[PDB]
Amino acid sequence: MHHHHHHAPPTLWSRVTKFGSGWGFWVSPTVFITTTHVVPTGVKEFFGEPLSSIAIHQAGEFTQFRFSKKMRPDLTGMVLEEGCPEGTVCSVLIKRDSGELLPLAVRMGAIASMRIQGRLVHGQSGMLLTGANAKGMDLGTIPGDCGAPYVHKRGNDWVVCGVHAAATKSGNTVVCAVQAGEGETALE
Domain named Peptidase C37: which ranges? Predict the structure, then answer.
């Protein structure tokens, strides 16, 4: 009784932050995420945090933002899911200027190691499940909404998948930029 379709977490929507030519997410008080193609060239600080006191770590369209200080504007600590099983419905957070939030949805596929620029990277595909917002280099972007963060309900909370990397030739299929860490060395 009353289960399908429910209210979305507010703080979860505020986590997203349109930077440069894309959108990121607040991994934690002093932690953040962002894509590579989204990163612009002109700014030297984020939310009042000079790069001089920041750390960057690329990894297949996955940059690790480590701030020297914990801004903690309205966060606490989110969970990162390195991919997803077969049948995982993820949702992106597309915020606009006039508050036109565009909540997109995508169905996760299988986990495999793709090859980009002669580099093996681990990422989970994702078939579109909305209409046809995909253009070819993203699930649904127009004014520069690339790299958007993915979210999903996990137990009694919402875990983040990756970021809007790009779309496939099929159009209704994008790749969720996953992070590198545990799970690859573990056996189970």
Answer: 8-188
